[PDB]
């Protein structure tokens, strides 16, 4: 009742039938067809499968609901971005508070995309939410350390030349005891989600540089944060993957917006 999974092309059409012309770029979910030909075919099939899922009513009616979940992913005030990797997925949490439960999250999954209206009110609460595309990993355990990017950049020119990991290891100098988290990190199997967030203050679409980055390694779970430094250049931070840690994180990526104070 707080949720409903459809297919991509369920989804196009009804972003059409309230107005929006086109998800959020993260979703990927693009024109199903492609003549006016085709267009004609898909509408006629859609009204079909909206109705014969009481989400559309005889009377041509949009389910007032679904469409505001979808009203509020198209046309959010606030938002992260959700890029999963592994062995499309792709999702966002949104939030359009004038119009709305305070959160739409949708989670896009091949041809399915789901819409599921949430109440959240403190960072933690996005932790079971962002974990939906990862592998349930506990958190790994491990002395935090930051690397540069030039100086990521130089280990994979080793790395590339046909150094071993092992070697590459010692010339960033990770410590003994970490070195089963680290491995981990930088093989597989793994699962990882990228994170940007958003807003749309001024009418102007800010986000933010940075990405944070979640992986689910055989080792267990590790966050990624980056900052850029004075020079520009990037310098992440990898730590355990904590609820508690992640929170901190995502409360500390959305700070970097002019929104500012989403909680
Ligand atoms: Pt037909
Ligand atoms: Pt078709
Ligand atoms: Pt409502
Ligand atoms: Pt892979
Ligand atoms: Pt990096
Ligand atoms: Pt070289
Ligand atoms: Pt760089």
């Given at each position: 009742?707080?949720?409903?999974?459809?297919?991509?092309?369920?989804?196009?059409?009804?972003?059409?039938?309230?107005?929006?012309?086109?998800?959020?770029?993260?979703?990927?979910?693009?024109?199903?067809?492609?003549?006016?030909?085709?267009?004609?075919?898909?509408?006629?099939?859609?009204?079909?499968?909206?109705?014969?899922?009481?989400?559309?009513?005889?009377?041509?009616?949009?389910?007032?609901?679904?469409?505001?979940?979808?009203?509020?992913?198209?046309?959010?005030?606030?938002?992260?971005?959700?890029?999963?990797?592994?062995?499309?997925?792709?999702?966002?949490?949104?939030?359009?508070?004038?119009?709305?439960?305070?959160?739409?999250?949708?989670?896009?999954?091949?041809?399915?995309?789901?819409?599921?209206?949430?109440?959240?009110?403190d960072p933690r609460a996005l932790v079971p939410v962002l974990g939906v595309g990862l592998s349930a990993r506990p958190p790994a355990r491990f002395e935090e350390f930051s690397m540069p990017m030039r100086v990521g950049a130089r280990a994979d020119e080793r790395l590339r030349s046909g150094e071993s990991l092992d070697e590459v290891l010692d010339y960033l100098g990770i410590p003994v005891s970490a070195r089963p988290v680290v491995q981990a990190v930088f093989s597989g199997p793994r699962s990882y989600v990228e994170?940007?967030?958003?807003?749309?203050?001024?009418?102007?679409?800010?986000?933010?540089?940075?990405?944070?980055?979640?992986?689910?390694?055989?080792?267990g779970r590790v966050l990624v944060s980056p900052s850029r430094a004075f020079d520009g250049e990037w310098v992440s931070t990898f730590s355990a993957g904590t609820p508690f840690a992640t929170a901190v994180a995502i409360d500390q990526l959305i700070a970097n917006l002019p929104d500012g104070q989403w909680f």
């Open positions: 009742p707080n949720a409903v999974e459809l297919t991509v092309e369920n989804a196009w059409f009804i972003a059409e039938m309230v107005g929006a012309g086109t998800f959020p770029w993260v979703l990927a979910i693009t024109t199903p067809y492609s003549d006016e030909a085709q267009r004609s075919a898909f509408f006629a099939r859609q009204r079909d499968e909206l109705t014969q899922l009481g989400l559309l009513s005889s009377d041509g009616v949009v389910n007032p609901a679904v469409a505001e979940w979808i009203k509020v992913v198209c046309f959010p005030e606030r938002w992260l971005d959700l890029r999963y990797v592994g062995p499309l997925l792709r999702g966002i949490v949104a939030q359009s508070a004038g119009i709305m439960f305070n959160t739409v999250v949708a989670l896009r999954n091949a041809q399915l995309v789901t819409f599921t209206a949430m109440d959240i009110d994170i940007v967030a958003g807003c749309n203050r001024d009418g102007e679409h800010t986000t933010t540089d940075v990405g944070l980055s979640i992986v689910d390694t055989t080792a």
